[PDB]
Amino acid sequence: KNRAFLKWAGGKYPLLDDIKRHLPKGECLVEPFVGAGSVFLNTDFSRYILADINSDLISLYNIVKMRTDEYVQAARELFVPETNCAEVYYQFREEFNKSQDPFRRAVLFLYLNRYGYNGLCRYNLRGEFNVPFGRYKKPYFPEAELYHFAEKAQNAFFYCESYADSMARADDSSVVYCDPPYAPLSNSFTLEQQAHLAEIAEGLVERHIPVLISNHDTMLTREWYQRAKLHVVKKVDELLALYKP
DNA sequence: TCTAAAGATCG
DNA sequence: ACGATCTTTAG
Ligand SMILES: C[S@@+](CC[C@H](N)C(=O)[O-])C[C@H]1O[C@@H](n2cnc3c(N)ncnc32)[C@H](O)[C@@H]1O
């Protein structure tokens, strides 16, 4: 069981076993909401199509892939005891937001993810990262996870685009796994998008393309994924919607 | 999920 | 320039 090098919400590590158990077999795996890519790191497809709306995220993934050794050596320099304090953090955060170099931003991005408050990723309407200092004892530099990501990424393509466009890339030999932002328990992921995602899923399964969707087990998710074989996992339970052709 | 301060929106 | 009400910001 492999871990990602990034702290990221929606890490489905406790549910990885349940996901792989319902995930159909295929040649290519498509992930419209790849995030930390825990599913990508713990499956075994011959090729992957990985996408996310976060441009900083996708940019990092490309750099780690194409320029692995150069990146690891550069990013490791920021994981020294001297950098674990507020003043250094807020200057590095300011350097990230003012940098126009993809490589430097990707290097600082890992630092901010490991030293930032609760590993959050928050922006303002200007696209500026504004997560405060995290105050951890000693942040772990995920060197092993980085190299393992780069190796598996050799069979993956990273795109920065909405789910509708990424799911449009899926063909006959493709399996689509969707891990959308959690449905509410009653710039966010609106209810209309939640419903639209299920609609696109029904379109793919009508074209003989397998689609698996994970989400909370609420009334809305039941109504959204009504045309799928629902599976309940595990307060609020977890739901798996399988669209089998 | 929290909040004080600053900006946005309308008639 | 007013003022109530959100909206945004960032620790
Ligand atoms: C809940 S996270 C899941 C991450 C991933 N499953 C993991 O293991 O880390 C959902 C991700 O989808 C991305 N996302 C949000 N809205 C999107 C949209 N409208 N289209 C495509 N991706 C989106 C977000 O950037 C977020 O990282």
Side-chain angles (χ1 to χ4, degrees), chain A residues 1-2 4-11 13-24 26-72 74-185 189-191 193-205 207-218 220-222 224-226 228 230-234 236-243 245:
Chain A
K1 189 159 298 180
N2 306 270
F5 63 94
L6 283 174
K7 299 184 185 178
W8 207 264
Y13 294 96
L15 317 178
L16 277 176
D17 298 311
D18 300 289
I19 293 178
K20 295 178 59 180
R21 183 157 47 236
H22 290 106
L23 190 59
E27 189 169 11
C28 176
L29 176 64
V30 179
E31 296 193 41
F33 311 87
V34 63
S38 56
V39 180
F40 153 73
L41 290 170
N42 287 278
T43 50
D44 197 78
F45 293 78
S46 80
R47 62 177 181 265
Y48 296 85
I49 298 183
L50 308 181
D52 198 286
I53 208 175
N54 191 310
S55 63
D56 291 319
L57 184 61
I58 302 300
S59 176
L60 168 68
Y61 283 165
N62 283 311
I63 288 172
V64 173
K65 170 177 179 174
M66 301 301 299
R67 304 159 69 173
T68 308
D69 291 315
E70 176 193 4
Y71 176 83
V72 176
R76 184 163 44 201
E77 287 185 344
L78 301 186
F79 283 71
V80 293
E82 292 81 4
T83 61
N84 196 17
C85 71
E87 295 120 304
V88 168
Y89 178 86
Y90 291 117
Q91 177 161 284
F92 274 154
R93 188 182 73 178
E94 181 175 323
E95 183 188 353
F96 171 84
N97 289 320
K98 287 185 179 178
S99 174
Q100 292 184 303
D101 174 36
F103 182 83
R104 181 57 180 176
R105 285 180 61 101
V107 167
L108 293 172
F109 192 88
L110 182 63
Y111 167 85
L112 296 173
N113 178 260
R114 288 289 173 178
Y115 287 69
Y117 189 85
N118 283 341
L120 295 183
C121 191
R122 182 181 63 188
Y123 306 92
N124 52 32
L125 291 173
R126 304 165 186 174
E128 297 175 334
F129 190 86
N130 61 6
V131 174
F133 185 59
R135 261 163 34 254
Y136 295 93
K137 268 61 181 181
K138 199 219 175 187
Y140 164 63
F141 178 70
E143 182 176 336
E145 289 77 2
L146 279 167
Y147 282 107
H148 175 257
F149 186 92
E151 272 161 1
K152 287 214 60 183
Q154 299 298 331
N155 305 115
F157 286 149
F158 300 92
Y159 300 99
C160 179
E161 56 195 22
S162 185
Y163 59 91
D165 301 322
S166 56
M167 294 175 74
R169 300 181 180 268
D171 63 330
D172 297 329
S173 63
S174 296
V175 183
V176 180
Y177 168 71
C178 295
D179 184 17
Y182 282 145
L185 303 181
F189 200 76
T190 64
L191 300 177
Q193 292 180 303
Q194 291 275 14
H196 181 212
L197 174 63
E199 176 185 345
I200 299 184
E202 302 180 38
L204 287 184
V205 72
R207 294 165 44 204
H208 298 294
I209 302 181
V211 174
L212 176 57
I213 302 183
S214 54
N215 206 328
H216 281 332
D217 198 345
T218 69
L220 281 176
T221 54
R222 290 279 191 177
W224 292 333
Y225 312 139
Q226 54 186 352
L230 305 185
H231 300 260
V232 185
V233 193
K234 170 202 168 303
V236 168
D237 318 285
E238 214 74 5
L239 180 59
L240 296 179
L242 179 58
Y243 292 83

